[PDB]
Design a protein around this ligand. Structure first.
Ligand SMILES: *[C@@H]1O[C@H](CO)[C@@H](O)[C@H](O)[C@H]1NC(C)=O
Ligand SMILES: [Ca+2]
Ligand SMILES: [Ca+2]
Lengths: 1291, 166
């Protein structure tokens, strides 16, 4: 609006604005101002040191500047040029700080101090090219509100189910006798208890359950109170702390009857990324081929690279030629390029690796000097192959290879370190850094890997992009970190003895803590401490939980757009790899220029299922077992079966054996079928005639052979078995980087991580005897323990031991239990110091982002492979690339719709109401009232609220019944039971009326809880009418039908890994709080799956590996008769869980990449040419004018149909005056009887408008040419009506 | 036709007709569990509690367990009606509500299973008996037997989006 438009010398200030140096000034204005928020040190109960006093006055200086800068621009530009959001928001920052002065000096407010955190966002308006990069994001999130609207409706479903079934179970105590102490055991979180049957016993020797609140963390996960069940469901979906909830419910109610609930939560919580991994990959793959393929920048980019090879290629010959005079100088390529050095320098490097894969923290006397002679020996030889490479190769070309540009910097770092320590006059800090520089010599293997030669190009393409991307990420962290220092301000005081250690009470402490929430590790402890800090779970205090939701949702998604741009890069790395395998092959193309009866047994269906069942019964015999009884009846009945199940299997072997002779063993499958029975022989023989475990383990090899006819190996993982030699490099790439950072870890963290149990002694000699453990910090409640070194169980001593610990960080699990332990390292063998050495955190964060960058890579390799599997059948196309193939699928196949209209005009008057949508909104309303009728159930409430609560549940049940009645009156059940949505509510209605009657009988009990779910289920009627999201699920329902056998692989893991673990990891006595207990048990089978299922979402498998080592108590009902008491646990747990987390997580990605193979077609539908809704719409127009289901429309009403479709597919608004007639004149429309034309002829004529055409002669040849294409696509030779459809569509 | 004439709706119907009589057997059967005080050993029943030391003595006293099971037979009565009519007029669609009632009837027996389990904890040994395993087998055959009949009644999601829900 540009207020009052005055010229005279404002123009000077206008010309002042257009000067370039405002980039030079004001960029440094922000960057100074963020440092002004860095060292702002918050102090808890109104305290200021000196620096906070000063910079409050310096906050006046920063407010002084922008108050000059902005109102000058209104005089410069005015309000027609503040239409910029970056000018619209920038001012909103400036406006509030001036208001903050006005309030601060009128009183001479607190929340008025935290709006000033937004000042880093002034960088965006200043710095160019970032305004694009944010708009990479906000135009990528918009294809997700059909996916985010699912979880929000799925939470509202899973919150109300929890609030009905679990209302107020968490309240009973485990207190002592008459006092007010909760009774726990040293490590245990105080779990609920119950004094009736079927739950906890509460056997802590001197206790009794009562009322009150011992419930979870500090009051946070009641299943009271709608507003809280929305929290704990949201805690479980992101999969960090859900098994804590399940142990709270199972200890409160009883097991075997909630685990149904939480598993269906996570299988629709693990399903949900499989929406959104591919939901975000949709537009990404689209933008890679609908921005740049519409542009053609890729040919421009690979041309300049092709010239870059010609520049480097032909310059070297000029470089070689003009200088070239010795009997040597050809002894170069005699030696250097020869095959001898390629198998000789590798030896020294592999010796320079095993010069480092020493380093104990003890190193007795040998390796102390043997590594010192190695730096003299191995560096010498290495120098030789430099100096031969320097002189007799060519000096300029040796500095032309980047890979040999690295070798000088090694051999510079080889000698200059070496000549320094000959002096010695230096700090032992300094020589400690120099030993870290010796780990550059591992990077000689990075010049290997031919696979890296595009993985180098994976990086060097994107440095223009991702460094602008990781500027935006590091911005997003510093925004939320400085917000955290104001919302939480070091309010973590508490007055207790527990170390709530992830406080925000610094800047770089807040930075590390904030990062933890992004990785999703342990953000309970962060959040639980946030809400406990303010007052309690309350009305004001609990609302700050949305700082940690928004940090976890908005934070995670921009991390996903980082992923997004990386997948584009390997697609460019695909094309530089694929097209190079054309052009490299084409250069050589220029350089080319009654045993017979037993076969009836092996074929029979009387034999086919009969060997399936004895697998399925041999499975179940392995399923339910004793394994800690040693003599019981279970062992002896099930012992009888598997000997007999060998016997039926034995005839299966012999009847197979007489079929084929010497050429029977040509199958490796056939070799596998035989060695099982051989092992079985001695399994059965040694028992019946007097370590015998291996005979029992290998019975589960029999259920392997079930997938004999399953091609889910032969299609899906065979596609990965193509890329398994590509990912055989890629997994061995990261394992090299898990190797090399282990050696950086060992050079830093030897001997440390070594902590006493009495935290004040720090040293070996000074830490024994006894000491005083205070239960809660009253200095009277004083207890004893012996003290000793707790060597902290994931230690960095040997490089074997290191990689087992960098693995736990790589699964993002317990890295804060390791980082906070890692900071406290002290001298070589000394206990921890509280916040010594804060700088060691940069080691884990660079390590994290490194592997978490690499993680994304492993996933990107998959999706590229998947697309290129679909292409191989599409290369005999001759079509519009699946656009025309869609129209082949639609214009041929699709019949009419169902379209029911009655007679008997009493019945019609019902029918006129039903399809008329005046009451479709009404059921929409009364569902939403039955949300809040179920969404106000507080706890303890009253008898006022109860009397309302029964009455409405009766009244709503009547209305849906009268709905059901009137729908049944018009649509008599042949009509009514056509739609499954009509069927499903009929399941609800009877299920609701029993909920009315069972409520009468208790007015006069488990289904009094259990049938209450039927009020919840009627919310799912909402998805009947939300078209945007109904087809999205429909797509993935159509998917999981198509891939059963891949999901049948993962359950072969759980089945096999349990029965292995069930016979090894029994006998492991179930002491509470030691992470293997009554709820995390190995003993029965079904426990086993949940413990395995706890690993698959990664809920702290860190701990449970440590609970099976060698020193666990042996469950005092089993064995071990004197003395040998603690010896039931083996070191095979290491190779168990580690291989389990690999082969599980891996197999699940093979599931998630497999769902691409169906639904890529859905993900990249052009919503600007012709999608499915249009072709879905056309089926519904027949439901208007052809309600007799004839499949034929008269020629007259064609015209009124073509005006009413929609313009983008049908005809526009200016209609028609010839055009929507002349188009039909310009097409193939036959006439059948009277005047009635079929649908498919009308369907095909309109669809040729979109999939464009030519005139007759070209159409008449197309009537064979599409008939040439479709007869191929008609895989069945039958159906001459399809050819009859082909002439009638051609007519 | 082929909904009715697939044998998979004939296999799953007959094994429901197993559990229908099995549930009907657990209607009358008074041997849910054994009273064992240590004699007045007795049997908790849906209708009458019979006590034996042969000096056998039937009596009664726990009330809603019969009445909840009264609806359970009443579904099975009503669930045979539309299922029998679903054969003889080529009316296919009545397999749907016949499957509906067969779902709920085993569900109400589960209620009485908990209600009789509730009668144990109120109180002398209680051991479960053969009529308990009558119902817990009758539960599964009416629950899992119904839904497979229900889902095979409903057509497919067919494979490919040009036919949906007809
Ligand atoms: C705790 O348990 C032990 C072993 O049963 C017993 O000696 C001791 O008296 C118990 N304490 C109490 C208070 O009952
Ligand atoms: Ca975790
Ligand atoms: Ca995790």
């Amino acid at each position: 609006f540009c207020l009052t438009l005055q010229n005279p010398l404002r123009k000077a200030c206008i010309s002042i604005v257009e000067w370039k140096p405002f980039e030079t000034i004001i960029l440094l204005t922000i960057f100074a101002n963020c440092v002004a928020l860095a060292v702002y040190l918050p102090m808890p109960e109104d305290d200021n040191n000196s620096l906070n006093l000063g910079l409050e006055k310096l906050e006046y200086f920063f407010l002084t500047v922008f108050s000059i800068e902005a109102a000058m621009k209104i005089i410069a530009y005015g309000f027609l040029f503040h239409q910029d959001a970056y000018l619209r928001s920038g001012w909103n920052v400036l406006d509030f700080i001036i208001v903050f002065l006005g309030v601060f000096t009128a009183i001479l407010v607190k929340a008025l101090r935290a709006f000033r955190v937004l000042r880093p966002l002034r960088l965006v308006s200043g710095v160019p090219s970032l305004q694009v990069v944010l708009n990479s994001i906000f135009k990528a999130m918009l294809p997700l509100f059909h996916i985010a609207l699912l979880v929000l409706f799925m939470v509202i479903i899973y919150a109300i189910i929890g609030l009905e079934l679990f209302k107020g179970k968490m309240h009973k105590t485990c207190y002592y006798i008459g006092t007010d102490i909760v009774a726990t055991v040293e490590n245990e979180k105080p779990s609920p208890c119950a004094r009736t049957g079927s739950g906890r016993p509460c056997t802590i020797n001197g206790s009794e359950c009562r009322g009150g609140w011992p419930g979870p963390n500090h009051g946070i996960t009641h299943f009271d109170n709608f507003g809280f069940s929305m929290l704990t469901v949201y805690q479980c979906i992101t999969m960090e702390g859900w098994t804590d909830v399940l142990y709270w419910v199972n200890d409160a109610i009883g097991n075997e009857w909630p685990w149904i609930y939480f598993v269906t939560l996570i299988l629709l919580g693990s399903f949900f990324i499989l929406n959104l991994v591919l939901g975000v990959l949709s537009g990404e793959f689209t933008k890679e081929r609908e921005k740049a393929k519409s542009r053609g920048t890729f040919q421009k980019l690979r041309e300049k690279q092709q010239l870059e090879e010609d520049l480097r290629g032909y310059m070297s010959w000029i470089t070689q030629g003009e200088v070239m005079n010795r009997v040597f100088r050809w002894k170069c390529h005699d030696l250097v390029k020869s095959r001898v050095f390629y198998w000789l320098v590798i030896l020294i490097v592999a010796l320079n690796t095993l010069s480092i894969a020493s380093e104990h923290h003890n190193q007795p006397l040998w390796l102390t000097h043997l590594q010192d002679i190695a730096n003299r020996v191995l560096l010498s030889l290495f120098t030789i192959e430099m100096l031969l490479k320097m002189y007799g190769l060519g000096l300029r070309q040796y500095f032309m290879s980047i890979f040999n540009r690295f070798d000088c910097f090694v051999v510079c770092s080889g000698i200059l370190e070496l000549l320094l320590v000959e002096s010695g006059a230096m700090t032992p800090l300094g020589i400690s850094v120099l030993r870290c520089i010796r780990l550059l010599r591992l990077f000689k293997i990075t010049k290997y890997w031919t696979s890296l030669s595009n993985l180098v190009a994976s990086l060097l393409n994107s440095i223009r992009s991702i460094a602008s991307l990781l500027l935006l990420l590091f911005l997003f962290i510093i925004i939320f970190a400085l917000l955290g220092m104001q919302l939480f301000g070091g309010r973590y005081d508490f007055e207790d003895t527990e170390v709530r250690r992830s406080n925000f009470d610094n800047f770089p402490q807040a930075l590390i803590s904030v990062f933890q929430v992004l990785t999703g590790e342990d953000w309970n402890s962060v959040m639980y401490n946030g809400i406990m800090a303010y007052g309690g779970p309350s009305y004001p205090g609990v609302l700050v939980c949305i700082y940690f939701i928004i940090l976890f949702v908005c934070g995670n998604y921009i991390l996903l757009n980082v992923f997004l741009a990386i997948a584009v890069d390997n697609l460019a790395e695909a094309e530089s790899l694929t097209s190079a395998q054309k052009a490299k092959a084409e250069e050589r193309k220029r350089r080319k220029m009654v045993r017979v009866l037993c076969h009836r047994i092996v074929n029979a269906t009387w034999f086919t299922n009969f060997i399936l069942l004895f697998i399925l019964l041999s499975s179940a015999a392995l399923a339910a077992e004793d394994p800690i009884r040693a003599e019981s009846v279970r062992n002896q009945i099930l012992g009888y079966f598997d000997i007999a199940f060998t016997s039926v299997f034995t005839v299966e072997i012999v009847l197979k054996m007489t079929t084929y002779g010497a050429f029977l063993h040509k199958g490796s499958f056939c070799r596998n079928y035989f060695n099982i029975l051989d092992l079985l022989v001695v399994a059965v023989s040694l028992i019946s005639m007097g370590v015998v475990k291996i005979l029992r383990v290998l019975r589960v090899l029999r259920p392997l052979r079930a997938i004999n006819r399953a091609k889910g190996l032969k299609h899906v993982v065979q596609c990965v078995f193509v890329a398994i030699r590509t990912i055989g490099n890629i997994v061995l790439v990261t394992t090299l980087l898990q190797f090399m950072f282990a050696c950086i870890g060992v050079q830093l963290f030897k001997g440390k991580f070594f902590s006493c149990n009495d935290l004040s002694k720090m040293t070996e000699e000074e830490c024994r005897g006894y000491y005083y453990v205070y239960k809660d910090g009253d200095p009277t409640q004083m207890e004893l323990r012996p003290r000793q070194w707790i060597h902290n169980d994931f230690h960095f001593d040997n490089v074997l031991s290191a990689m087992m610990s960098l693995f736990t960080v790589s699964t993002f699990e317990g890295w804060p239990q390791l980082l906070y332990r890692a900071i406290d390292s002290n001298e070589e063998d000394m206990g921890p110091v509280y916040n010594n050495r804060v700088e060691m955190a940069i080691f884990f964060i660079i390590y994290i982002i490194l592997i978490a960058f690499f993680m994304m890579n492993i996933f990107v390799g998959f999706v590229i492979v998947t697309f290129q599997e679909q292409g191989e059948t599409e290369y005999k196309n001759c079509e519009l690339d699946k656009n025309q193939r869609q129209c082949v699928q639609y214009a041929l196949k699709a019949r009419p719709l169902r379209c029911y209209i009655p007679k008997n005009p009493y019945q019609y008057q019902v029918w006129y109401v039903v399809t008329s949508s005046y009451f479709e909104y009404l059921m929409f309303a009364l569902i939403m009232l039955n949300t809040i009728c179920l969404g106000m159930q507080h706890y303890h409430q009253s008898e006022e609220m109860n009397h309302i609560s029964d009455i409405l549940n009766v009244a709503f049940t009547i209305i849906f019944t009268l709905e059901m009645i009137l729908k049944l009156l018009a649509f008599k059940a042949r009509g009514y039971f056509g739609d499954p949505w009509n069927v499903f509510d009929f399941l609800i209605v009877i299920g609701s009326i029993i909920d009315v009657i069972l409520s009468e009988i208790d007015t006069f009990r488990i289904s009094s809880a259990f049938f209450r779910l039927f009020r919840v289920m009627r919310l799912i009627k909402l998805l009947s009418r939300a078209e945007g999201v109904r087809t999205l699920l429909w797509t993935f329902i159509k998917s999981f039908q198509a891939l059963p056998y891949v999901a049948l692989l993962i359950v072969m893991l759980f089945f096999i890994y349990a029965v292995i673990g069930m016979q090894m990891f029994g006998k492991i006595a179930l002491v509470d709080g030691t992470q293997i207990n009554r709820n995390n048990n190995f003993q029965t089978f079904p426990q086993a799956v949940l413990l395995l299922f706890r690993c698959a979402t990664g809920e702290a498998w860190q701990e449970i590996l440590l609970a099976c080592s060698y020193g666990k108590l042996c469950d005092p009902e089993s064995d071990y008769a004197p003395g040998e008491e603690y010896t039931c646990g083996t070191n095979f747990a290491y190779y168990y869980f580690i291989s389990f987390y690999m082969l599980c997580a891996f197999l699940i990605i093979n599931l998630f990449v497999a769902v691409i193979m169906d639904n890529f077609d859905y993900l990249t539908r052009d919503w600007s040419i012709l999608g499915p809704h249009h072709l879905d719409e056309f089926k519904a127009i027949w439901a208007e004018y052809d309600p007799e289901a004839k499949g034929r429309i008269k020629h007259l009403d064609v015209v009124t149909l073509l005006r009413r479709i929609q313009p983008p597919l049908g005809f526009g608004k200016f209609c028609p005056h010839r055009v929507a007639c002349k188009r039909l004149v310009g097409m193939n429309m036959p006439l059948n009887s009277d005047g009635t034309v079929t649908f498919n002829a009308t369907l095909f004529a309109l669809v040729r408008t979109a999939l464009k055409i030519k005139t007759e002669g070209n159409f008449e040849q197309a009537n064979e040419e599409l008939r040439a294409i479709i007869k191929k696509i008609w895989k069945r030779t039958s159906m001459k009506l399809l050819d009859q459809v082909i002439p009638p569509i051609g007519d | 036709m082929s909904p009715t004439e697939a044998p998979k709706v004939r296999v799953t119907l007959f094994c429901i007709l197993v559990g229908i009589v099995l549930a009907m057997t657990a209607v009358v059967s008074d041997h849910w569990a054994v009273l064992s005080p240590h004699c007045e050993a007795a049997h908790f029943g849906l209708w009458r509690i019979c006590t034996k030391r042969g000096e056998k003595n039937c009596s009664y006293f726990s009330i809603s367990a019969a009445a909840i099971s009264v609806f359970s037979l009443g579904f099975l009565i009503m669930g045979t009606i539309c299922a029998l009519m679903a054969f003889r007029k080529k009316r296919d669609y009545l397999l749907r509500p016949a499957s509906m009632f067969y779902v709920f009837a085993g569900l109400c027996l589960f209620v009485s299973l908990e209600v009789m389990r509730q009668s144990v904890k109120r109180m002398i040994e209680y051991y479960y008996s053969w009529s308990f395993a009558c119902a817990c087998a009758a539960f599964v055959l009416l629950f899992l037997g119904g839904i497979s009949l229900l889902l095979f009644s409903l057509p497919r999601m067919p494979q490919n989006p040009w036919e949906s829900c007809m």
